[PDB]
């Protein structure tokens, strides 16, 4: 089958540049910020209009988009686009000024009854970067119930994200309840107890 | 040159309800050069019909495209439940911009959010920064509405974020958490989390005293 694979997506700083290439067996290349819609950056887009510069190889099966002097804005998933259409996987472009860093872990202890086999914790998984982090409750055991939100970019720019779960009010005294934070790209794995207040 | 915009923001159907999607744009686009396309949650987007009315290959028959001029329309014959996703409409002619999106969710009975609310941990607070979060649990519709009050005082720093639709019970949960530093917090006493939603007749309220 047609198919497109996607490569050089990474960490950028706001002044750096980067390249990131396609190879298929007229292109179109498209971006989407996390949350945000489709935006289309050039096959220019007039924020990229200058700093992006499109070019194409016949011969080595590629096209390229030549990212020079990123800025923030700039932070999203890049596609490829070329009658039977082929997308790319995507690969995530990220540009900070931030340098990577673990989640720091607070437990969002059990109270607010709200009772009746309802009763609601989670963990706070705060300050890390880049993304993205995993959550799991129990080692994988807990699955019904648990919400893990996306994450919310701070004014630091470090990434804040809440990860909850809802259990019967009548097991949190007899169950106990950790969760699994992973955070791969700075190597971190974290387990925090939440015990009520 | 030419801007985009599409209604609704977000629509609301039952499997086997008829959708009509609409694209709008500031000046004329040509029938050769609209195209319709479909993206799923964590997928890459899917071409659905180009030329405003011509599908792509392995295409259903429920995607109709329609339109010429200034306005197009994407009709769902009878939605099925992989048709729940997000629609962008893009012109390729002088501009190439995709439009804004149309959200098509499945329409649940309504349930009101189940309201909690966490005090700052006394290891964060160990930090220098106290973050309340106050949860909006399993709702429908997705639009809800939170509000913070540090003391019976309303505040203008927080932040908030929604799931997507969840793909068993087909409701939505929505966190916001107040952050203030520990000089901020240690001051005032009771804080409170106000919760307005279709579901409930009368706004929730759910707080906390600092001392507890």
């Known amino acids: 089958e047609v198919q497109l694979v996607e490569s050089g997506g990474g960490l950028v700083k706001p002044g750096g540049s980067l390249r990131l290439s396609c190879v298929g067996s007229?292109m179109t290349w498209v971006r989407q910020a996390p949350g945000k819609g489709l935006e289309w950056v050039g096959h220019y887009a007039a924020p990229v209009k200058g700093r992006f510069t499109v070019s194409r190889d016949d011969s080595k099966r590629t096209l390229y988009l030549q990212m020079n002097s990123l800025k923030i804005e700039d932070t999203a998933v890049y596609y490829c686009?070329?009658?039977?259409?082929?997308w790319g996987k995507g690969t995530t472009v990220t540009v900070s000024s931030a340098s990577t860093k673990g989640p720091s872990v607070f437990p969002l202890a059990p109270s607010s009854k709200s009772s009746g086999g309802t009763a609601a914790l989670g963990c706070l998984v705060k300050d890390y970067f880049p993304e993205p982090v995993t959550v799991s409750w129990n080692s994988g055991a807990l699955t019904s119930g648990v919400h893990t939100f996306p994450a919310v970019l701070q004014s630091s720019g470090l990434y804040s994200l809440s990860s909850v779960v809802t259990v019967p009010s009548s097991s949190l005294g007899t169950q106990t309840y950790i969760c699994n934070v992973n955070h791969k790209p700075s190597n971190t794995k974290v387990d925090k107890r939440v015990e009520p207040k | 040159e030419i801007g985009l915009t599409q209604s609704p923001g977000t629509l609301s159907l039952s499997p086997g309800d008829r959708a009509t999607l609409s694209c709008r744009a500031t000046?004329?686009?040509?029938?050769?050069?609209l195209a319709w396309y479909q993206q799923r949650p964590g997928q890459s987007p899917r071409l659905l019909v180009y030329?405003?009315?011509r599908r792509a290959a392995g295409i259903p028959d429920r995607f109709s495209g329609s339109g010429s001029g200034t306005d197009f329309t994407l009709t769902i014959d009878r939605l099925e439940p992989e048709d729940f996703a997000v629609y962008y409409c893009?012109?390729?002619?002088?501009?190439?911009?995709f439009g804004p999106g149309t959200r098509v969710d499945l329409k649940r009975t309504v349930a009101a959010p189940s309201v909690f609310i966490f005090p700052p941990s006394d290891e964060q607070l160990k930090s220098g920064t106290a973050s309340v979060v106050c949860l909006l649990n399993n709702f429908y519709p997705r639009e809800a509405k939170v509000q913070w009050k540090v003391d019976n005082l309303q505040s203008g720093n927080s932040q908030e974020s929604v799931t997507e639709q969840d793909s068993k019970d087909s409701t939505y949960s929505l966190s916001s958490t107040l952050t203030l530093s520990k000089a901020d917090y240690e001051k005032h006493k009771v804080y409170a989390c106000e919760v307005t939603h279709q579901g409930l007749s009368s706004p929730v309220t759910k707080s906390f005293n600092r001392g507890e």
């Open positions: 686009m070329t009658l039977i259409d082929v």
């Open positions: 007229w």
């Open positions: 000046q004329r686009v040509g029938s050769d050069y």
């Open positions: 030329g405003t009315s």
């Open positions: 893009r012109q390729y002619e002088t501009s190439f911009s």
